[PDB]
Amino acid sequence: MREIVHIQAGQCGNQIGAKFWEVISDEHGIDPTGSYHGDSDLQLERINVYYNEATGNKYVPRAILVDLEPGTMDSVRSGPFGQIFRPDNFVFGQSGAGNNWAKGHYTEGAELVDSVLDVVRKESESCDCLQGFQLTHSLGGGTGSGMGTLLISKIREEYPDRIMNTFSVMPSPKVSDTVVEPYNATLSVHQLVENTDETYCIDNEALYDICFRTLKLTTPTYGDLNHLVSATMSGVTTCLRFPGQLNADLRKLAVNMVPFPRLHFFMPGFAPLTSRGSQQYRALTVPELTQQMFDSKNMMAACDPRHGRYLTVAAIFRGRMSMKEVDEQMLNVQNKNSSYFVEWIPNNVKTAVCDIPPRGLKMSATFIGNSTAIQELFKRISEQFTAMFRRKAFLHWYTGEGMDEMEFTEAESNMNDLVSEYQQYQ
């Protein structure tokens, strides 16, 4: 029960997917074949939430994959745990839509939604009951991800009761491969504010710094880069998959961290994060796991939380502990950092626990936060979007097989109207 379906829109989502399902499957004790081999009989009691029981004592995911390019699909099924998929859910296209968002979201993807909506219409109705449509799409850069905005705007017509999560990878100027990240990222937000009920604004800028500073690695390889992004959301869903002294679902995080429906963006955080030698020199307690998350450096969102004050947060701890240590530390942080939290929301913080921590770690954690600080990111993209937009550039890809010039003003206006709401609370 409380099923959840998982989609990959873009080259980011799939390498995220191949690791998303490599921690989870290994968190359930699973081989590349599909057959369970774990020793704990507990981790199957809600294996259903992701997987679907198939023949031969083999469980397999509901992993929908869309890129509009086979070159990425070939990476998945060939990689580790590439057999652990439904080849019906593998989906292809002709061209990658040219980093446009005008081809995918309108023309070259709309000729494909009928091939990926039917399977989720199939595979959502296949199960008993479900919680949401989560996915992993780069809000900027790759346009097969921005095409997913079509995929999210249509489920709201189908399943408006459910909640669609978005483990969205933001753009960032310090790390901007794609040149038109403001074009597709700014316009996609016009939909997610109206459609999505949650959004985890991961960003590659900070996410490197976590990989340099906290872990002290010579080079972030994408394989070693997403082992922490696979774990930052496994810790969100572990509260479903496993029994908690205090329990939570994707809807509880929503209602308890969303004062208003448009202010439903977030910044995640995972702890503990350690090197090899620098692991033995940490206490392995809730204070050690507490400061590891609230600190500005351990924040996938490319922002400075010291500026903007957290409206709401959540701390989905893991591993058997005492709730006092989980309570007083979340309570102490709310007092001393009174400015970084809000006055008119007493006890911003949540908690949540499990008795099954991830392999190798005897204790783990996870952080979520809706904060005013996201205005810095939205200012950062909109400050240069208007530059690329004033004295219009690249618009005939957006006029041909695209939209009118007024679409930009409505999105930019409603997107700038949004940032004022964050400014209202600081």
Binding site: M1, E45, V258, R320, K324, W344
Partner: protein, 428 residues
């Protein structure tokens, strides 16, 4: 023939219930299968060839906590039908867990209570464990109590409702759903044995000096208090005080029923070797602001009445001096109208505490209640929490999205406001 039934609800009742029936299964001497190698009649039922099953009912729309029970060591004795599991929880949302999804389940749970009520000869009443912050543990009870009230209005429906602390409020919206239920509590129930979760951390960190507690250690404590209330109707005693007596003499007015709880002795095993635990000692260990488990200041308030449920080797003569002792105290006070507010229940049987627990195998024990005016300062915090944001109208669009209009929020608070003023009215 003396009978009563437990209604565990939400995440709270189940986590309590796995540890609440951890006690009863050890009070009477029955394996966790159901077999017993009379007292048990009130909460068990002799069925089959030596298999006693509890008169419980568990309802958490989260299917997880019950699956821990259905898979746990107590999988056998609990009847699988009354172990309701639901499909998806209300996610700490009152209006969601009240009628939107709760209506799918009330049709089922009301059959088992009607199965047990018709199977039970005569009930003194019900008892329902729940928490406010659970949403589905709370709004479901808002719908359950009125069904049970209409179905059973004459019976007494007490509740050991968990209550959030002003500091450690584990949820974010539980300042909402708390006062929403208290508008419903006074209407239907007759005594809400409020308990705070942050207080017990201060109870256990200091008295039985546990460095870090789990809800297990917390729950094993609040099992003793409930068993101590119900030992009179469940065991022999020099002065039995069953469920129907103390609720009648503790509650002056039909709305003023919110007694804070207390238990003693609460001490570790190593520390119990030192104190003799005399009745004047443990009785005096009940009224200080520390040992109370609701996080209020009783010294600023005044007791109306109290009810002491002694256990173990106890004789009235030493408490007759105790009840005279506290009437001399001036820090402790009493409202003018009640001259004496000390019911004295005894049970020759000791607590028979749980194993693997922090508490000690003391040969004496005390529960204690008080329908004070000090409880008003508790929700004076929460009423401020609720009022400052409902003016801002934050977190309300979920409740509106689930069906509950905005009018109920203003009607629930003003009732608590009007309820609060009575404590200053009754006080003088």
């Amino acid at each position: 023939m003396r009978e009563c039934i437990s209604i565990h609800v939400g995440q709270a009742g189940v986590q309590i219930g796995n540890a609440c029936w951890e006690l009863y299964c050890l009070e009477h001497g029955i394996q966790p299968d159901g077999q017993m190698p009379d007292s048990f009649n009130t909460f068990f039922s002799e069925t089959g060839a030596g298999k006693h099953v509890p008169r419980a009912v568990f309802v958490d729309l989260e299917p997880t906590v019950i699956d821990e029970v259905r898979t746990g060591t107590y999988r056998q004795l609990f009847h699988p039908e009354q172990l309701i599991t639901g499909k998806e929880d209300a996610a700490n949302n009152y209006a969601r867990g009240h009628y939107t999804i709760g209506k799918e389940i009330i049709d089922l749970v009301l059959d088992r209570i009607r199965k047990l009520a018709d199977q039970c000869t005569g009930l003194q009443g019900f008892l329902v464990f729940h928490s406010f912050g659970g949403g589905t543990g709370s709004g479901f009870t808002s719908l359950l109590m009125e069904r049970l009230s209409v179905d059973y209005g004459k019976k007494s429906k007490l509740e050991f409702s968990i209550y959030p602390a002003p500091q450690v409020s584990t949820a974010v919206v539980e300042p909402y759903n708390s006062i929403l239920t208290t508008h419903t509590t006074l209407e239907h129930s007759d005594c809400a044995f409020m308990v705070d979760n942050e207080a017990i951390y201060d109870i256990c960190r200091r008295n039985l000096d546990i460095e870090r507690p789990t809800y297990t250690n917390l729950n094993r404590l609040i099992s003793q208090i409930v068993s101590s209330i119900t030992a009179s109707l469940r065991f022999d005693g020099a002065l039995n005080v069953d469920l129907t007596e103390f609720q009648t003499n503790l509650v002056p007015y039909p709305r003023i029923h919110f007694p804070l709880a207390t238990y003693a002795p609460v001490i570790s095993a190593e520390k119990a070797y030192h104190e003799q635990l005399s009745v004047a000692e443990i009785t005096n260990a009940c009224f200080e602001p520390a040992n109370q488990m609701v996080k209020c200041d009783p010294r600023h308030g005044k007791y109306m009445a109290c009810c002491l449920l002694y256990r173990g080797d106890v004789v009235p003569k030493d408490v007759n001096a105790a009840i005279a002792t506290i009437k001399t105290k001036r820090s402790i006070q009493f409202v003018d109208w009640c001259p004496t507010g000390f019911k004295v229940g005894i049970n020759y049987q000791p607590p028979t505490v749980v194993p693997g627990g922090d508490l000690a195998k003391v040969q004496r024990a005390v529960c204690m209640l008080s329908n004070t005016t000090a409880i008003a300062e508790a929700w004076a915090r929460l009423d401020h929490k609720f009022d400052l944001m409902y003016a801002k109208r934050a977190f309300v669009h979920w409740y509106v999205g689930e069906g509950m209009e905005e009018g109920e929020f203003s009607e629930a608070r003003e009732d608590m406001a009007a309820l609060e003023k009575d404590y200053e009215e009754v006080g003088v």
